[PDB]
C-alpha cells in the first residue's frame, strides 16, 4: 500500500512578501518539487510524469499555476478579515493526496494546518473546520465554500486525478520503487553515560526499503538493553540506522551486531566485536578526540 503526498509550504511575512513551495512524495521517494522561483512543476525522477500525455500534464500545470497565484491573493485578503487584525508571520501548510489500496480502491485527503496546527480539511464537497480549530475560521470557510469553481476543481483533483495519476505512477516507477539496496555495517564505542560503562554503537547505512532488524547478540541471546535509533535519510534516497548497547568494562567480549534486511537475501550481516574484521575497520576510522553527549 502506497501514499501519494503533495506537501505545500506557504509563508506570509507582510502584505507584499509571500512564498509558496511544494514537494511531492510517493511513499519515501520524492517525485516532484515546485519552488516559488520556478514557474513550472519540476520532475525529480524520470517517471515523475507517470502515464499522462504531454497535453494532459500541460493542462494540469496550467491550472496549478492559476491556483498558486489565486491562493496567494485569497489568503492575503482573508488575513485582513482574520482576527486579531493581521497576525504576521503567517504559516500555512497543505497536505493533499491519496492512499492506494488493492484494486480500484483509493482514499483521497486534503489537510490544512495554520501556524503548524491542523485546522481545516476538504471533506466530500466542502471545506470544513476540524474539532478544536479556532471559531474565527468559520467565516473565511463560509466565504471559501462560495467558490463553486474551487469546490468542483478540488473534487476532480481528489476524486479522479489523484488516484488515476498514482495508478500510472506506480506502474511507471515500479523498478525504482521495488529497488533493493544492500546495507553496510560498522562498529564504534563511547564512554557514555553511567560510571564504569561503555556504549557500543552499531552503524547500519545505505539500505532500501526502510524496514530493518539490528540487534546486539551474545551468541543466540538477544541483548534486551539495545536502543534502536531513528531512521535517518541519506542523499541517494537510502537509509541510516544505529543500535546502541551500554556495557560494563570487559563485558564487550562475546558481543556481535546482527543485521537482517530484505536486500541481503538471508545472508545477514554479522559483525563480531573484537574480531580481525573489526580491528581492521577500527584502524582506518580513527580520529583525534575525547567524547561529549547532548542528546
Amino acid at each position, epitope marked *: 500500500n502506497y501514499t501519494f503526498r503533495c506537501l505545500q509550504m506557504s509563508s506570509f511575512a507582510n502584505r507584499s512578501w509571500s512564498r509558496t513551495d511544494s514537494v511531492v512524495w510517493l511513499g519515501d521517494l520524492q517525485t516532484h518539487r515546485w519552488s516559488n522561483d520556478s514557474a513550472t512543476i519540476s520532475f525529480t525522477k524520470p517517471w515523475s510524469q507517470g502515464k499522462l500525455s504531454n497535453q494532459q500534464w500541460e*493542462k494540469l500545470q*496550467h*491550472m496549478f499555476q492559476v491556483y498558486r497565484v489565486s491562493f496567494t491573493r485569497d489568503i492575503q485578503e482573508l488575513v485582513k478579515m482574520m482576527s486579531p487584525k493581521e497576525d504576521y508571520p503567517i504559516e500555512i501548510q497543505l497536505s493533499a493526496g491519496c492512499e492506494m489500496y488493492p484494486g480500484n480502491a483509493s482514499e483521497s485527503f486534503l489537510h490544512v494546518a495554520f501556524q503548524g496546527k491542523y485546522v481545516v480539511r476538504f471533506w466530500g464537497t466542502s471545506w470544513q473546520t476540524v474539532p478544536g480549530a479556532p471559531s474565527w475560521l468559520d467565516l473565511p470557510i463560509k466565504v471559501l465554500n462560495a467558490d463553486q*469553481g474551487t469546490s*468542483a*476543481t478540488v473534487q*476532480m483533483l481528489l476524486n479522479d*486525478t489523484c488516484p488515476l495519476f498514482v495508478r500510472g505512477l506506480l506502474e511507471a516507477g515500479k523498478s525504482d520503487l521495488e529497488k533493493q539496496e544492500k546495507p553496510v555495517a560498522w562498529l564504534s564505542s563511547v564512554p557514555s553515560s553511567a560510571h564504569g560503562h561503555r556504549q557500543l554503537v552499531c552503524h547500519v547505512s545505505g539500505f532500501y526499503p526502510k524496514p530493518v532488524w539490528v540487534m546486539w547478540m551474545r551468541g543466540d541471546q538477544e541483548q534486551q538493553g539495545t536502543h534502536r535509533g531513528d531512521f535517518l535519510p541519506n542523499a541517494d534516497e537510502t537509509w541510516y540506522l544505529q543500535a546502541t548497547l551500554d556495557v560494563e568494562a570487559g563485558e564487550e567480549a562475546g558481543l556481535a551486531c546482527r543485521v537482517k534486511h530484505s536486500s541481503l537475501g538471508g545472508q545477514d550481516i554479522i559483525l563480531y566485536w573484537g574480531s580481525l574484521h573489526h580491528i581492521l575497520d577500527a584502524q582506518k576510522m580513527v580520529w583525534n578526540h575525547r567524547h561529549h553527549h547532548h542528546h
Partner: T-cell receptor
Amino acid sequence: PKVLQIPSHQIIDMGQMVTLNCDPVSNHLYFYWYKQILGQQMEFLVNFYNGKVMEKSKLFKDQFSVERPDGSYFTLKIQPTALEDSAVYFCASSFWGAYAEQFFGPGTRLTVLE
Amino acid sequence: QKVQQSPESLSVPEGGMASLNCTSSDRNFQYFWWYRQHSGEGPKALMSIFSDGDKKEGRFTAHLNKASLHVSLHIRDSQPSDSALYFCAASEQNNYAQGLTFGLGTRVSVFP
C-alpha cells in the same frame, strides 16, 4: 460582466478574409469559439489560454486562426471563406478550462454566399 | 451520438411540470451541465451536476446517476420565460482544459 461580440451579422463573399471579434469577461482566463448551425447543433471549435491554443476540434480547419493580443479583442479569422462556413459563431469565456461555467456571447451571424 | 437527449420537443401547460432526460454513451463523459438557449441568443448555464443525486435550484432540479450515466432536469411551475431550447452538455472526467459536448437539445414550449 458579459461576453460581447462585434458585429451582430456579417455578409461575406467566398474566398474573402473575415474577422469575428469578441470581448470576453474581465478576469476570465480560458476563451472559446463555438459554431451553431440553424440554431440547433452547438459545435466546439477552439480553446485558447495563456496566449496559445489549448484544445481544437476536427471542425477547426487550417482556414481558421485564433488570437488574443494585449489590449485587443479575442478574434477568429477565416481565410479563405467557404459556403459551409455560413453559421452563428459563439464566443465563450470561463475562469477555468473545465468544470466551471462558460459565459456565451450574443454570437455573430456569418453568411458566406456565392 | 455522445450525448443523447429525450424528448426532441416537449409542450407543458403554465404551472405544469416537465421532465427532461439525458444519457452519456462514454464512461469518461460522466459530469454534466444543463444549458438553456432562448431562440436567437447565446446559451445560459442553468446548473452543473457533478455528484449523484438531486440539485435543487428553485423551480429546477437536476438528478444524476453516474452509475447509469443518466442526468435529468425537472421543471416545476413552468412559466413562459422557461420556453427555450434545453441543452445537456457533458464534461470528460479528469481533463482540466476542454470544450462542451452538447446534445441536440429539447425544445420546451410552455403553453397557457
